[PDB]
Amino acid sequence: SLALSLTADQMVSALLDAEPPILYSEYDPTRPFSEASMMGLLTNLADRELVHMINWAKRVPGFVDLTLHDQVHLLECAWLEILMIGLVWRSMEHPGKLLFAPNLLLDRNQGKCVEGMVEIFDMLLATSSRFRMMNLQGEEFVCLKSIILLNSGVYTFLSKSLEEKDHIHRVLDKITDTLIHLMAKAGLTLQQQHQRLAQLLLILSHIRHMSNKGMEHLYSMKCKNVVPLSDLLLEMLDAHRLH
Amino acid sequence: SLALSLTADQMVSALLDAEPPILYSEYDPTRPFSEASMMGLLTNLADRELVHMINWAKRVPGFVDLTLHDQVHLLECAWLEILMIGLVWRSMEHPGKLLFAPNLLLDRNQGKCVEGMVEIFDMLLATSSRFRMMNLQGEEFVCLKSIILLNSGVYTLEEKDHIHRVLDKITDTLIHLMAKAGLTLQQQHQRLAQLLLILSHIRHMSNKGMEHLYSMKCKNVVPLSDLLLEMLDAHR
Amino acid sequence: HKILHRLLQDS
Amino acid sequence: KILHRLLQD
Ligand SMILES: C[C@]12CC[C@@H]3c4ccc(O)cc4CC[C@H]3[C@@H]1[C@@H](O)[C@@H](O)[C@@H]2O
Numbered sequence: 001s002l003a004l005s006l007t008a009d010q011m012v013s014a015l016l017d018a019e020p021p022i023l024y025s026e027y028d029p030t031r032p033f034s035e036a037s038m039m040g041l042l043t044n045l046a047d048r049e050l051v052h053m054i055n056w057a058k059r060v061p062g063f064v065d066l067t068l069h070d071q072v073h074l075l076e077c078a079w080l081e082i083l084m085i086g087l088v089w090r091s092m093e094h095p096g097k098l099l100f101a102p103n104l105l106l107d108r109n110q111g112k113c114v115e116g117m118v119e120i121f122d123m124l125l126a127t128s129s130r131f132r133m134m135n136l137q138g139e140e141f142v143c144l145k146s147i148i149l150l151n152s153g154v155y156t157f158l159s160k161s162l163e164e165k166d167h168i169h170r171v172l173d174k175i176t177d178t179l180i181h182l183m184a185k186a187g188l189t190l191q192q193q194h195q196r197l198a199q200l201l202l203i204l205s206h207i208r209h210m211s212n213k214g215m216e217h218l219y220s221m222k223c224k225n226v227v228p229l230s231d232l233l234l235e236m237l238d239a240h241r242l243h
Numbered sequence: 244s245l246a247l248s249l250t251a252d253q254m255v256s257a258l259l260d261a262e263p264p265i266l267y268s269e270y271d272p273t274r275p276f277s278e279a280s281m282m283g284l285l286t287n288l289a290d291r292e293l294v295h296m297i298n299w300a301k302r303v304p305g306f307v308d309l310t311l312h313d314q315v316h317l318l319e320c321a322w323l324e325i326l327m328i329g330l331v332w333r334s335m336e337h338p339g340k341l342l343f344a345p346n347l348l349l350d351r352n353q354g355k356c357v358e359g360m361v362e363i364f365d366m367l368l369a370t371s372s373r374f375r376m377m378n379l380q381g382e383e384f385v386c387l388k389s390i391i392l393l394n395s396g397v398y399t400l401e402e403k404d405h406i407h408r409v410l411d412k413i414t415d416t417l418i419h420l421m422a423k424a425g426l427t428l429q430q431q432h433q434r435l436a437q438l439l440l441i442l443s444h445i446r447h448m449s450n451k452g453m454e455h456l457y458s459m460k461c462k463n464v465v466p467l468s469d470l471l472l473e474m475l476d477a478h479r
Numbered sequence: 480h481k482i483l484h485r486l487l488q489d490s
Numbered sequence: 491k492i493l494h495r496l497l498q499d
């Protein structure tokens with residue numbers, strides 16, 4: 001397994017170099033927003049990002065080591081968390097706003113135009129503010145985003161008893177080693193290293209929460225025929241089960 | 244800020260001392276299960292447990308420092324996560340079963356009795372198996388449960404900073420336990436990460452369970468206590 | 480007058 | 491399944 005033999009510094013380089021591009025929305029400023037048109041812009045954007053996410057996942061060390069069935073499951077579990085952590089990262093330098101794309105920077109009042117969205121917008125804004133106060137570094141961000149990919153679906157590998165996916169866990173341990181290496185090299189004390197590692201990982205629980213609320217919100221928009229979803233988005237949504 | 248003064252060992256003794264009692268189901272072993280009947284037992288149980296959880300929360304160091312308002316908020320956010328991590332812990336020693344109560348130990352098949360529940364049972368069993376795999380210790384368990392209480396609504400201030408100070412102390416305590424157990428530094432950081440990543444999965448299960456409980460409430464399969472309806476309503 | 484409010488004040 | 495296809499390409 002290549003991944004396992006990477007050094008910290010090599011782990012960081014692969015992840016940094018695998019980063020996807022920042023895409024643009026189809027925002028058209030000649031027109032006012034509706035619930036329907038806002039949902040349209042956001043899902044059109046998500047849909048295009050997914051194609052880049054799949055390519056990025058393939059470049060996360062150890063990911064290509066799994067069966068297609070396993071890769072499919074992980075991305076199905078993590079895709080919205082991953083779009084969200086990316087969004088909150090892009091938004092860090094824009095206190096009060098969410099940078100969905102460079103041409104689509106929205107404040108919570110604009111989020112109100114979609115029924116049930118503002119509550120999630122508020123959680124996203126708060127997460128961005130938390131990253132800003134913690135002074136999250138890009139090297140640390142890429143590590144968390146990979147941990148999300150490898151972790152979120154891991155305890156749903158049911159055979160229905162949990163399969164031992166030591167490979168994934170071995171990779172997750174390497175990313176832990178890398179986060180710690182980055183913090184040490186950043187000058188943090190031993191106690192500060194474990195404290196920060198904890199603060200960063202606890203945020204992932206909040207990102208999971210936001211993902212579950214956004215998935216429910218997206219399912220609601222579909223069941224109200226607010227926006228046509230791409231077949232990919234329909235399949236990713238369907239992976240989660242909502243009623 | 245007395246919680247800030249506590250030593251690692253004193254934090255562990257405090258949390259161990261604060262552990263709630265293990266409650267019994269009303270279940271009668273001779274009588275067979277229904278869907279309204281299964282939900283009745285589970286929810287009757289949860290509701291009695293809730294009253295003890297509140298006493299426990301009050302003994303989690305730093306919790307009583309917060310406004311009554313913030314205390315209400317943390318418990319409304321965390322309560323189902325806390326019941327689930329307790330459940331998972333009780334079941335660690337019963338592979339393939341969930342020890343809801345000593346007289347109510349359910350196999351995954353017994354979860355098919357309630358519409359939509361088997362999927363959550365599967366996740367709970369997988370967590371139990373993961374704890375078993377890691378050989379999770381009681382001392383580690385009580386630290387994790389307190390982390391759930393204080394973390395699960397901290398993003399939903401002098402208050403904020405206090406909570407994060409306390410969370411850092413519980414982190415110091417976990418690491419203390421692992422170093423006392425003989426783990427290398429590298430192994431300590433790895434185990435800490437493994438444990439906190441599991442909270443992500445417990446958050447996920449709570450979310451799903453909350454939408455499942457709401458679906459039962461509507462279908463009128465089971466009458467819920469006022470307190471439960473209130474704890475359920477805060478999630479909407 | 481949430482029940483949870485009363486419970487926290489009373490224990 | 492679309493994802494399955496995209497993972498091969
Ligand atoms: C799913 C979603 C539309 C797409 C949004 C998106 C698009 C692109 C992106 O990069 C990140 C995000 C993160 C948030 C995503 C929204 C959720 O908050 C739901 O409320 C809403 O239905």
Ligand SMILES: C[C@]12CC[C@@H]3c4ccc(O)cc4CC[C@H]3[C@@H]1[C@@H](O)[C@@H](O)[C@@H]2O
Nearest residue numbers: 285286288289326327330363452455456
């Ligand atoms: C909320 C719940 C009934 C009560 C259950 C319970 C009872 C007691 C307990 O200690 C822990 C748990 C954790 C699981 C709880 C169920 C969720 O999985 C939902 O599917 C279902 O509606």
Ligand SMILES: [Cl-]
Nearest residue numbers: 266267291292
């Ligand atoms: Cl009792």
